[PDB]
Amino acid sequence: DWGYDDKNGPEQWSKLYPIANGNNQSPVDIKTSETKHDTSLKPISVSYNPATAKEIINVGHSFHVNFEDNDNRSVLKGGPFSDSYRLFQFHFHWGSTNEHGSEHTVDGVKYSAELHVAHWNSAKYSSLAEAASKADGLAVIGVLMKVGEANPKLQKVLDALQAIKTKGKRAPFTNFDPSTLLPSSLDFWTYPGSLTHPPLYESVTWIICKESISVSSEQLAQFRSLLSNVEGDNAVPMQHNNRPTQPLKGRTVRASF
Ligand SMILES: NS(=O)(=O)c1cccc(NC(=O)NCCNCc2ccccc2F)c1
Ligand SMILES: [Zn+2]
């Protein structure tokens, strides 16, 4: 049973999941003097249908907002992709304090949290379960979250947490378009990487936005007040769930800009 504490955390994951020391692990530090601009990269295009929003779930180490993924109502196209990728989830990562909650870093700078909007390749594969382990199976947009002014676009998400306070609780989460959470510019970096927690499959093409979005100290406190225990047990707040950055191992981060 993996987690983020000192006994089951990132630094121990390789014992149960050897891919943790792999050649395509995420997150990474994006060193902008080493990025290579690629004129062949097309703009990112997202088109999400709010009716695909389904459920919010406390998964112990985090919470997930899941989407109906039976058709192409909600898709990501463009960027480095020739295939259409189907939205299935978004979630966040955060840290113990405002100093350090993002997963990716830019030129060594740590942000306070990070938004992940995840998709799977429905042109090539028949389901998320099939796609999750394929090199070209997943596409995840990462948005760095900079502590500052309260972000009103987060309101529905934050308001839902009181119903899923403890591990395993879940609730309907409907009529929501998560492209409202993205920054106004979709200039991006892209690199081949992995899931940032077990099973850590090297199946993710990452799309990291250049522009950050805001989040307030108090909104971050709402994340950290989620509980990792089941109802009735001693309360254990979800204090952090970000993985340290991992070596590029010769990978190239491409810039759309
Ligand atoms: N931090 S991340 O690398 O952007 C990222 C992105 C998409 C999903 C997750 N986590 C998550 O799905 N947990 C449920 C675990 N069983 C479902 C499952 C298993 C393997 C792959 C995907 C998947 F959905 C994390
Ligand atoms: Zn994530």
Side-chain angles (χ1 to χ4, degrees), residues 14-15 17-238:
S14 74
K15 291 185 290 198
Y17 307 88
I19 204 58
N21 293 319
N23 294 332
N24 291 79
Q25 288 293 291
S26 306
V28 304
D29 181 53
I30 298 179
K31 290 164 180 55
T32 56
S33 61
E34 300 182 21
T35 60
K36 305 224 310 212
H37 174 93
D38 191 340
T39 66
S40 73
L41 285 169
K42 280 71 203 192
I44 290 300
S45 161
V46 291
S47 175
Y48 303 149
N49 188 325
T52 54
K54 189 201 317 201
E55 190 171 48
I56 193 170
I57 317 174
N58 180 321
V59 301
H61 58 90
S62 187
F63 69 93
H64 292 163
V65 180
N66 289 320
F67 290 77
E68 308 184 7
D69 64 345
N70 51 287
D71 60 13
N72 281 333
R73 278 172 301 159
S74 294
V75 300
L76 162 71
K77 298 168 189 174
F81 308 114
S82 47
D83 301 329
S84 171
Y85 284 73
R86 177 176 305 175
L87 171 69
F88 70 97
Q89 180 187 109
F90 75 84
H91 64 253
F92 304 84
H93 301 259
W94 58 90
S96 291
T97 62
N98 298 357
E99 312 302 309
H100 63 84
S102 71
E103 297 214 293
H104 293 83
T105 62
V106 179
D107 291 316
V109 179
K110 302 159 191 175
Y111 290 91
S112 292
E114 188 168 326
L115 161 68
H116 287 164
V117 186
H119 316 69
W120 61 268
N121 188 336
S122 61
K124 293 193 54 174
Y125 309 115
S126 308
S127 72
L128 168 66
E130 170 181 17
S133 68
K134 314 279 180 202
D136 56 358
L138 306 178
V140 188
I141 303 172
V143 184
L144 293 158
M145 300 174 60
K146 182 177 201 294
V147 63
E149 286 172 6
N151 189 335
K153 314 274 194 56
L154 297 175
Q155 194 56 55
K156 188 189 170 83
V157 171
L158 292 165
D159 291 343
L161 300 186
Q162 45 71 36
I164 55 151
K165 267 296 180 167
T166 49
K167 180 172 182 159
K169 284 199 82 178
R170 61 202 66 219
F173 189 97
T174 62
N175 190 33
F176 181 79
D177 178 349
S179 73
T180 59
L181 298 175
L182 302 180
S184 69
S185 166
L186 296 183
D187 288 347
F188 66 94
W189 300 286
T190 184
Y191 76 97
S194 71
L195 304 169
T196 67
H197 60 69
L200 296 161
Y201 293 147
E202 307 188 318
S203 60
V204 178
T205 305
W206 278 97
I207 303 291
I208 305 305
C209 294
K210 179 195 73 183
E211 186 179 319
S212 71
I213 62 173
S214 76
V215 65
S216 73
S217 296
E218 294 75 39
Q219 291 180 318
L220 294 171
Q222 288 192 253
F223 292 162
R224 305 199 198 92
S225 76
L226 278 171
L227 301 174
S228 64
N229 53 284
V230 304
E231 173 171 317
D233 283 358
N234 308 314
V236 186
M238 247 176 239

